[PDB]
């Protein structure tokens, strides 16, 4: 859920 642009694809 911690989407951050380039990191908008994770299990957070």
Query: CA 12 to CA 7: how far, in whole Å?
Result: 10
Name the experiment that determined this structure: NMR
For residue 4, give the 3-state DSSP assignment.
Answer: coil
- List phi, psi (to 5°) of 6: -65, -15
CA dihedral 2, 6, 9, 12 (to 10 degrees): -20
3-state helix, strand, coil in the chain (%, to 5): 25, 0, 75
* Contact status, residue 2 vs residue 12, Cβ threshold 8 Å: yes
CA 8, distance to chain mean position in Å, is 3
**Cα 6-8-9 angle, rounded to 5 deg:** 105
Query: CA 12 to CA 2: how far, in whole Å?
Result: 5
Q: Which residue has the tokens 């908008």?
A: 8
């Amino acid at each position: 859920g911690s989407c951050f642009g380039a990191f908008c694809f994770r299990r957070d």
